[PDB]
Enzyme design. Structure first.
Site, PDB file in Angstrom:
ATOM      1  CB  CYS A 187      -0.958  -0.026   1.177  1.00  0.00           C
ATOM      2  SG  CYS A 187      -0.126   0.157   2.814  1.00  0.00           S
ATOM      3  CB  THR A 188       0.065   4.811   0.446  1.00  0.00           C
ATOM      4  OG1 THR A 188      -1.262   4.506  -0.042  1.00  0.00           O
ATOM      5  CG2 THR A 188       0.565   6.131  -0.153  1.00  0.00           C
TER       6      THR A 188
END
Length: 264
Positions: A187-188
């Site tokens: 994810c980010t």
């Protein structure tokens, strides 16, 4: 001493920090006011989420402001080693200071997920780069649909979820027969994979891996010519997304984002 105008050496002189830490915070509710007050005093804008399980946030200011506020946060011995991962812009991408109290620092909606016992599952950007070129690896984005559509890793699967709390249902209906398969998640900035990986490890998944400090860590570490990242990386602030150079996408993307980490 901080009270004199002195422009940064950088044109992009606003620092944007991203951070999280899982640590039991028995008095987490009592931390909200002191942190918020310091944000107001210093002029930090951003959102910090506090829960019994720890802390997560994103916030921005110039270097002098960040010096004071980093030091303040780290004055709590439980936060002494908070790692503020920085990106940069010439504008503060946050509208105001917020501190939120939540049941989880990122909401997956599953009671007893312990992100300890994630040992051995983290891949550095360099390890990850090699790992996910294997067409037999199940490369799984853990982000929401709006994030995946802006950009993702080459060959990554979209779970097509609107909110992170929909992730366990996705595992239950799609991956339960694949517990012996190589599964690589990202994810980010890493926070969601902490929970997805722990959750799945407990379920009996034997080969789950997560990108350490997430996409932004990869983009910083891997040269663009070699990068397996495609498109833009969504961020939960005014920038909306950043490019492979970790710059705010220009021209500006529509800001119906929607943004803050509480919606994540």
């Amino acid at each position: 001493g901080h009270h004199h105008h002195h422009h940064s050496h950088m044109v992009k002189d606003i620092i944007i920090a991203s951070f999280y830490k899982f640590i039991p915070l028995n008095d987490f509710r009592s931390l909200r006011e002191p942190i918020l007050t310091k944000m107001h005093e210093i002029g930090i804008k951003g959102t910090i989420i506090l829960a019994h399980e720890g802390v997560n946030g994103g916030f921005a200011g110039n270097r002098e402001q960040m010096n004071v506020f980093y030091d303040y946060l780290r004055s709590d011995s439980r936060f002494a080693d908070l790692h503020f991962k920085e990106t940069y812009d010439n504008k503060n991408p946050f509208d105001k200071a917020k501190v939120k109290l939540r049941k989880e620092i990122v909401t997956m909606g599953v009671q007893k997920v312990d992100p300890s016992y994630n040992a051995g599952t983290y891949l550095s950007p360099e390890e990850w780069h090699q790992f996910i070129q294997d067409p037999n690896v199940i490369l799984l984005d853990t982000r929401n649909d709006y994030e995946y559509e802006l950009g993702t890793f080459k060959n990554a699967i979209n779970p097509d979820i609107e909110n992170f709390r929909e992730f366990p249902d996705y595992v239950q209906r799609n991956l339960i027969d694949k517990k012996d398969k190589k599964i690589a998640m990202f994810c980010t900035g890493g926070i969601r994979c902490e929970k997805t990986t722990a959750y799945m490890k407990e379920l009996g998944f034997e080969h789950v891996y997560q990108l350490h400090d997430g996409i932004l860590n990869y983009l910083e570490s891997i040269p663009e010519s070699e990068s397996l990242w495609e498109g833009k990386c969504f961020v939960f602030d005014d920038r909306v997304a950043v490019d492979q150079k970790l710059d705010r996408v220009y021209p500006q993307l529509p800001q119906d984002y929607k943004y803050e980490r509480e919606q994540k």
